[PDB]
Amino acid sequence: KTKALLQMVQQFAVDFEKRIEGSGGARINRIFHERFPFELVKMEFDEKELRREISYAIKPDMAFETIVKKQVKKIREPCLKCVDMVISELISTVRQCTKKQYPRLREEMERIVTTHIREREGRTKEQVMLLIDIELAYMNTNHEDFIGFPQLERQVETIRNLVDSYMAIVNKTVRDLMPKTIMHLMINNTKEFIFSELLANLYS
Template sequence: MFLLLSYIFFCVHRTGLFTPDMAFEAIVKKQIVKLKGPCLKSVDLVMQELINTVKKCTKKLATYPRLCEETERIVAGYIREREEKTKDQVLLLIDIQVSYINTNHEDFIGFAKNVYKDYRFLELACDSQEEVDSWKASLLRAGVYPDKSSTENDENGQADNFSMDPQLERQVETIRNLVDSYMSIINKCIRDLIPKTIMHLMINNVKEFINAELLAHLYSSEDQNTLMEESAEQAQRRDEMLRMYQALKEALAIIGDISTSTVSTPAPPPVDDSWLQHARRSPPPSPSAQRRPTLNNPPTRPLSGRGPAPAIPSPGPQSGAPPVPFRPGPLPPFPSGGEALGGPPQVPSRPTRAPPSVPSRRPPPSPTRPTVIRPLDSSMLD
């Protein structure tokens, strides 16, 4: 950049005390022309994104393949037409910026702020060496370099003298600052205008075309019957859905007939098993305590001709058969004389284990009345 500015400045250099503006304009125009490539690239990217969006939207028309293809063809063709017009407008904006370099822009630093006089020598008067060094450092930072001796110029050659000329370097630095200031203005303007141009000439215009003119183009392109032809997959899917609908309809009719002809009976009430739970919680009492009381004197058969009847053996601990457990029933009458049998018998609860088997016992012989033979009455004989 420095060499380019140096050669341009050397070619357009004219007499005068100010920096020539021709070098500034030549550099600025070349930099502006380089913006055409990025601007056109942005238009291409927007166009490609629009086409991708159209393809995504037309996928919803996959049921009608011909309609989908025709819609995509019409919209894509219109987008390409708007692309050409947008590119022409972008190039026109770049040419407008190149046609005139506005150095009076409010954001431009301007030549008036960069005017300097072509003094060859400066005289300094300082009291100490430190002040001299400080002034030299400040002048070097400002672009003022000390003059070289003739011996150094002879050794370095004419090319080095041209490249290290303090005046040329100062002017090149000035041109660089001016170019940077003006190009920042151009970049700001281009970044603002190019998106607006693309939005107006491409995106908004395509939206209006789809809303207002796409339907008319579809009607005028082909026969509407051919556009609305379904694909083979969609027709097969529709037939399957119709068959499924008929099958479900018949199934519902059969279920309805069964529901109306079936007679149902109410379920029986639940069984009350609270007593079983109570028996599980409380252990059963001993069977010996619930044994039915026995009489001291069991009834005997009256005397007859056959002899005395055998007495009923009383159960004892040496008896082979176990006692019969008492089952709940009506309470026996209490014996006379106020003697109680120890209170009413307790009702045993059913144990969880299997009940013991009841051994068979032959019942005792019941006592019989003596037979009395009476003589027949004579009246009865008559």
């Protein structure tokens, strides 16, 4: 235990920032991230569905409401998939060095390591979940799209133009947002462990 932690697992550490920020980061980035967007389009929607609910609803923001609740449910499918792909190589790397063979050594060694990673892998995934729930609270609709234009004349005018834009564009959002996310987030949590975390626990 003294020999194994002290020397062997320090050359292992420095390999991680490096390659990732110049699979490792070189082609983690190109392949995965830029083929991800396709995934997006399929299990998501825009256009004329959006129009129906809003117009009935008034008879501007309040009308919009019904849409987003069911739409966000559909955003789980694509977003999650990208996440998992990163996880495979990176999460398994940490344990990928921690066995060093000796049956005396393995028994103590395992119990300390496995449980730490267990709790912490959940963090990153959860942050993705957060983004989806977000929608329900405000739902502004006056978008980068262009503005509209007894006492009917002022009221309904404003409804029509606004809502329509949002459905397409929100979909645009997620496709880039997941990939970006991962680099900052996914990355740091686990990174620590294998680099440094590992040697630390067994002692302490």
